[PDB]
Design a protein around this ligand. Sequence first.
Ligand SMILES: C[C@H](Nc1nc(-c2c[nH]c3ncc(Cl)cc23)ncc1F)C(=O)N(C)C
Length: 163
Amino acid sequence: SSFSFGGFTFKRTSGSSIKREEEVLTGNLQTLKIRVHEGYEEFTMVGKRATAILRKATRRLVQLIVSGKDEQSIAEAIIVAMVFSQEDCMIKAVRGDLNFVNRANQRLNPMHQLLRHFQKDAKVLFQNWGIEHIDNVMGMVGVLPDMTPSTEMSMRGIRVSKM
Ligand SMILES: C[C@H](Nc1nc(-c2c[nH]c3ncc(Cl)cc23)ncc1F)C(=O)N(C)C
């Protein structure tokens, strides 16, 4: 529909999805109960410092083309997208405990807890997502897990566009 997550306005342009509660295992073998969105969808993510076009299948980011003000703003959109995708490699990239016990995390649904976790440090998220060789498309660049640009390789399904 039209909703917000991690500071971005999401607007669905194609497809549809249904919700099914599912148990997932983190890289720390912690069980999380998440509402999995099933179905292929395309979205525009609109933020104050970055915008993107997201194509996602059930628990699988297919493509993310992002533009933004700078490396940091772009990385923020990428993190929000990777979390939003509900991919297994993102869930498995959680390597410590996801505290649901403490007073401050009570109002946090799993997806929002995952988001907070990766926003604190996205190093393992980016390093475990995977890289691919990229085809040459002008006006688009690949981005390595350290957010340095490359015309050779990129984080899987991720491309950076010029503003
Ligand atoms: C705020 C968002 N609200 C909505 N999310 C979705 C949605 C569609 N496909 C998705 N895929 C993944 C996730 Cl994660 C959420 C969605 N649709 C309508 C919404 F109000 C939400 O519930 N989460 C990010 C968990």
